[PDB]
Amino acid sequence: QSQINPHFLFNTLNTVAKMAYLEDAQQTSRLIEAVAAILRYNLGDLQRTVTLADEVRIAREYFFIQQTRFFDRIKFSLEAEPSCLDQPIPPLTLQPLIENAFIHGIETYEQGAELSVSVFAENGRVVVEVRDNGVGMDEQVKAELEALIRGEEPRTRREQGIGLHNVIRRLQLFYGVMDVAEIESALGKGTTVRLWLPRWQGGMN
Amino acid sequence: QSQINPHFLFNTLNTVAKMAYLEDAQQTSRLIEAVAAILRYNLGDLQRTVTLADEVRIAREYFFIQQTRFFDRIKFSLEAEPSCLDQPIPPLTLQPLIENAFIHGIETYEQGAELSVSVFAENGRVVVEVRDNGVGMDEQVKAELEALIRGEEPRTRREQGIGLHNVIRRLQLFYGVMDVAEIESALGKGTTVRLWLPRWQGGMN
Ligand SMILES: [Pt+2]
Ligand SMILES: [Pt+2]
Ligand SMILES: [Pt+2]
Ligand SMILES: [Pt+2]
Numbered sequence: 423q424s425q426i427n428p429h430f431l432f433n434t435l436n437t438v439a440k441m442a443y444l445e446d447a448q449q450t451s452r453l454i455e456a457v458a459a460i461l462r463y464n465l466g467d468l469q470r471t472v473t474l475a476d477e478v479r480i481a482r483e484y485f486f487i488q489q490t491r492f493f494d495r496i497k498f499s500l501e502a503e504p505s506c507l508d509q510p511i512p513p514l515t516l517q518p519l520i521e522n523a524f525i526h527g528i529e530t531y532e533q534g535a536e537l538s539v540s541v542f543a544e545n546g547r548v549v550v551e552v553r554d555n556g557v558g559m560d561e562q563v564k565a566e567l568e569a570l571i572r573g574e575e576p577r578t579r580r581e582q583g584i585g586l587h588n589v590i591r592r593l594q595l596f597y598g599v600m601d602v603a604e605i606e607s608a609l610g611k612g613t614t615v616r617l618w619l620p621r622w623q624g625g626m627n
Numbered sequence: 628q629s630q631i632n633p634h635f636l637f638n639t640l641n642t643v644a645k646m647a648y649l650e651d652a653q654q655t656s657r658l659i660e661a662v663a664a665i666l667r668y669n670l671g672d673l674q675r676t677v678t679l680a681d682e683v684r685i686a687r688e689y690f691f692i693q694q695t696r697f698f699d700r701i702k703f704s705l706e707a708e709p710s711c712l713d714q715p716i717p718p719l720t721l722q723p724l725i726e727n728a729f730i731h732g733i734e735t736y737e738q739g740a741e742l743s744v745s746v747f748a749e750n751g752r753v754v755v756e757v758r759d760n761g762v763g764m765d766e767q768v769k770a771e772l773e774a775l776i777r778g779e780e781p782r783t784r785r786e787q788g789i790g791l792h793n794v795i796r797r798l799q800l801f802y803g804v805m806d807v808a809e810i811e812s813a814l815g816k817g818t819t820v821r822l823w824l825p826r827w828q829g830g831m832n
């Protein structure tokens with residue numbers, strides 16, 4: 423179950439933010455503002471519709487926080503075509519991919535990790551690429567994800583926040599198409615998770 | 628599922644704490660230290676054995692945080708017999724009861740809410756009393772909790788962090804006895820959840 427209570431955490435973060443302002447701790451206030459933004463977004467209704475612009479905004483807050491702590495170890499890159507950012511999308515689509523690539527990087531490198539996010543149009547899809555230079559994801563994990571993308575329910579296992587499996591399922595349900603992602607990975611050559619989202623000039627629901 | 632990632636939250640809180648120290652934001656640092664203490668404790672192994680002394684320490688951190696935000700609305704009281712505090716107990720036993728009583732209070736009162744925690748020996752049990760002056764818990768919720776205490780599995784319902792049900796079950800399993808709690812509640816007269824823990828001069832497992 424969840425051993426943490428998020429509502430208490432969020433309110434407490436607000437109290438910390440108030441004290442940081444009262445003590446004129448400007449850099450502390452900026453960090454709290456970033457993590458409060460992420461927490462608030464992740465606590466929202468998971469069935470709402472947002473746009474890629476909202477997802478990218480949250481990504482920037484994440485990179486600001488992580489850069490503060492890990493500046494010597496990992497390089498972050500974020501690029502996006504503006505015309506793609508009004509794409510409707512389920513919330514918390516991008517963050518699980520970014521967290522995945524971040525863990526890949528810091529587990530593989532003392533320094534030299536790389537995490538890149540790219541958002542761009544290709545034919546009639548909006549492509550979202552999240553790339554890391556890690557050691558490459560496990561072959562069986564990759565196979566089960568690809569089976570899920572094809573519509574085959576993978577093996578149910580005990581003790582199975584939001585992972586790549588849930589992201590893929592929510593995208594398939596949201597867009598009404600199964601082929602919403604592909605995974606590119608090889609030993610020593612890193613991992614790219616590439617989302618292929620049907621271009622929707624507007625449909626939240 | 629969990630829409631929040633706690634490991635990122637904890638690390639980020641550490642980064643905020645570092646910045647607060649660097650900016651000499653002393654009151655902000657104290658608040659972060661308190662919530663970091665709670666988060667770290669709640670993220671520990673749920674199957675470890677702690678003592679009531681550890682549970683009460685976490686309670687004090689909680690009251691410090693809540694008093695900072697709610698000082699005009701609610702009065703907190705915490706009393707304990709020292710000889711009881713070496714009692715072994717499952718972690719996160721007390722916090723769910725305190726959070727329950729806190730919600731009761733702030734939902735009932737604009738100001739005038741009361742939350743009291745008392746720990747004391749009675750015959751061969753350690754009693755833990757958590758009392759609120761709220762409107763009284765719902766009769767059906769109380770009945771199902773009492774059935775659980777008696778060993779009857781209550782009605783399973785869809786969409787059912789840690790609640791009073793889980794606390795009771797963990798206590799029954801930990802101590803090997805079913806009659807580990809009682810609930811005292813009446814309309815307009817508040818709620819007391821009273822734990823009756825077999826006095827163990829030592830047994831963690
Ligand atoms: Pt909340
Ligand atoms: Pt709260
Ligand atoms: Pt709360
Ligand atoms: Pt992986």
Ligand SMILES: [Pt+2]
Pocket residue numbers: 633634635637670
């Ligand atoms: Pt963790």
Ligand SMILES: [Pt+2]
Pocket residue numbers: 634635638
């Ligand atoms: Pt992290």
Ligand SMILES: [Pt+2]
Pocket residue numbers: 525634635
């Ligand atoms: Pt992490």
Ligand SMILES: [Pt+2]
Pocket residue numbers: 727763764765768
């Ligand atoms: Pt209640």
